[PDB]
Design a protein around this ligand. Structure first.
Ligand code: ADP
Ligand code: MG
Length: 301
């Protein structure tokens, strides 16, 4: 693909650093023609097919091609792409409100009803992605951000499509990637991957959101890999004493070793914790609350 060959600085004024990836740095920028703010992701090109630094042409194209296709309120959009000798620069929708968990950590308390209002928007972004056969493959708290933390009902934006893949019916995909505490057993075990891995990671995010504890985290990476593979977790009372039974059921349906038996995105949206079937189930979710004291500790780590 020819991407834009002009200098990005002819069109944007860049500002403060937002974040960084292994071969990427993300900066805030302002488009000169509109005065509107975006995020510029500068990805270092590899340089020789022979080299070890930088991202391959294939991998940059895959990320661009996926973002280009997506148009949904809970996922970032791609605005423009530029290229020079050293970098491909993606101009992305800016997510200016930081990480969801940091915003929630600034609260006094959070009921499960309040928590599901945020979690439902994650589920809506992923439902959109899976309906297009896109696996995100790096769902974790740092990639769940807020468009604007100053509004009364902040909107979730899923970011970071650098590991995302369109599922190819017809070939198997296997690869090592992602953060050990947040990946599914099929990643841990180098088995065929699909849309199910995303579902497992949502189960981990939800477990943390309610408890402030990471369910599979060990003292070493090896122990974390071994806990994930064995599905070795529990809901210990210290952490989950105010958690509804519906919330444990939702998590248990996601934290399932066999991908074929795990809950899909369409079913997660119909689960009674998300969509209560009667007034009694709705009151259980309204009265139940997150373990805020432990949650704050987790968000400061
Ligand atoms: N659209 C965005 N808005 C605000 N911050 C962003 C945006 N995209 C990425 N970032 C920040 O930059 C970091 C690095 O970008 P990311 O896309 O995660 O790169 P990688 O694909 O290499 O992991 C993210 O973890 C986040 O902190
Ligand atoms: Mg990232």
């Amino acid at each position: 693909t020819v991407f834009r060959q002009e200098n990005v600085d002819d069109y944007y004024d860049t500002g403060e650093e937002l974040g960084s990836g292994q071969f990427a740095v993300v900066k805030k920028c302002r488009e000169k023609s509109t005065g509107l703010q975006y995020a510029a992701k500068f990805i270092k090109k590899r340089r020789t097919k022979s080299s070890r630094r930088g991202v391959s042409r294939e991998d940059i194209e895959r990320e661009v091609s996926i973002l280009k296709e997506i148009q949904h309120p809970n996922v970032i959009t791609l605005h423009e792409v530029y290229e020079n000798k050293t970098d491909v620069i993606l101009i992305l929708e800016l997510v200016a409100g930081g990480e969801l968990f940091d915003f929630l950590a600034e609260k006094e308390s959070l009921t499960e009803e309040e928590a599901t209002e945020f979690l439902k928007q994650i589920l809506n972004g992923v439902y959109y992605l899976h309906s297009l056969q896109i696996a995100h493959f790096d769902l974790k708290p740092e990639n769940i951000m807020l468009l604007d933390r100053n509004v009364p009902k902040p909107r979730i934006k899923i970011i970071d499509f650098g590991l995302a893949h369109k599922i190819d019916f017809g070939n198997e995909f296997k690869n090592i990637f992602g953060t050990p505490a947040f990946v599914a057993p099929e990643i841990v075990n180098y088995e065929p991957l699909g849309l199910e891995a995303d579902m497992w990671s949502i189960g981990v995010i939800t477990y943390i959101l309610l408890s402030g504890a990471s369910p599979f985290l060990g003292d070493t990476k090896q122990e974390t890999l071994a806990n994930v593979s064995a599905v070795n977790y529990e809901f210990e009372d210290e952490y989950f004493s105010n958690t509804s039974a519906l919330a444990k059921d939702f998590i248990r349906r996601l934290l399932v070793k066999d991908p074929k038996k795990r809950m899909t995105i369409q079913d997660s949206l119909q689960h009674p914790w998300i969509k209560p079937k009667d007034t009694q189930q709705a009151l259980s979710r309204k009265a139940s609350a997150v373990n805020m004291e432990k949650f704050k500790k987790f968000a400061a780590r």
